[PDB]
Design a binder for this molecule. Structure first.
Ligand SMILES: CN(Cc1ccc(F)cc1)C(=O)CC(=O)C(=O)O
Ligand SMILES: [Mn+2]
Ligand SMILES: [Mn+2]
Ligand SMILES: [Mn+2]
Length: 225
């Protein structure tokens, strides 16, 4: 259960990240979590781009979208959508010099590795940046660029609820979203998913997980793909 004050302050108090006199105030690494679409009913693809300000977090980008055809063409669509958001966030924040991405590979491990590669090729065509992916060892023990969700989801949700209520999770006032803002405010949209958090959710799961993978404890899992 999320406090009404935290919801109110999340809406009215946002980080002004474009003052050139304040570029050296923020963390220089962008953490991205991607939750791909999974179908009786179909879920969408959730993407969140978070960063650090001291011991707090700020959301830079959010993407939530549903596909019309889910046969390999969707992999290109998911990757391009995520890459477009990342490129725009990096264009506005020149202080970001590292990119740490986690692609959820629970639904399909092979498709997750394909998406990771597609994002890496798009981002590297557009900008010169260090790109690291979360690596998990597969059935054959070879490290692959995907994240596997399990029991730790309970820990990540718990951690989030405590940080959110303390006001340690804030939005950027130059928050990038190409998929949302379609008769919405991206924050008001995210807040609706926050109010339904229990003990569609793809966007809040991406926010919870991106802020969870910020920890030093996970740093060793991020490698060049
Ligand atoms: C079923 N899984 C994979 C999963 C498996 C085990 C686990 F602990 C956590 C996640 C989904 O990711 C579903 C989803 O996004 C959705 O319905 O929007
Ligand atoms: Mn408002
Ligand atoms: Mn998922
Ligand atoms: Mn999902």
């Amino acid at each position: 259960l999320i406090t009404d004050q935290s919801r109110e302050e999340f809406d009215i108090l946002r980080y002004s990240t474009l003052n050139t006199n304040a570029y050296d105030y923020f963390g220089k690494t962008l953490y991205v979590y991607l939750d791909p679409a999974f179908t009786r009913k179909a879920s969408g693809t959730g993407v969140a781009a978070v960063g650090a300000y001291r011991h707090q977090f700020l959301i830079y980008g959010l993407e939530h979208f549903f596909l019309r055809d889910l046969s390999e063409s969707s992999e290109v669509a998911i990757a391009e959508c995520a890459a477009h958001m990342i490129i725009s966030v990096l264009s506005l924040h020149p202080y970001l010099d590292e990119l740490r991405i986690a692609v959820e590979g629970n639904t399909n491990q092979a498709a997750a590795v394909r998406i990771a590669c597609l994002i890496r090729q798009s981002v590297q065509s557009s900008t010169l940046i260090r790109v690291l992916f979360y690596h998990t060892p597969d059935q054959n023990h070879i490290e692959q660029p995907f994240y596997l969700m399990g029991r730790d989801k309970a820990l990540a949700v718990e951690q989030f609820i405590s940080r959110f209520n303390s006001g340690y999770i804030k939005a950027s006032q130059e928050l990038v979203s190409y998929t949302i803002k379609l008769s919405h405010d991206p924050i008001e949209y995210l807040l609706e998913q926050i109010q339904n958090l229990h003990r569609s959710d793809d966007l809040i799961i991406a926010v919870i997980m991106a802020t969870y993978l910020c920890d030093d404890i996970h740093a060793i899992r991020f490698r060049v793909s």
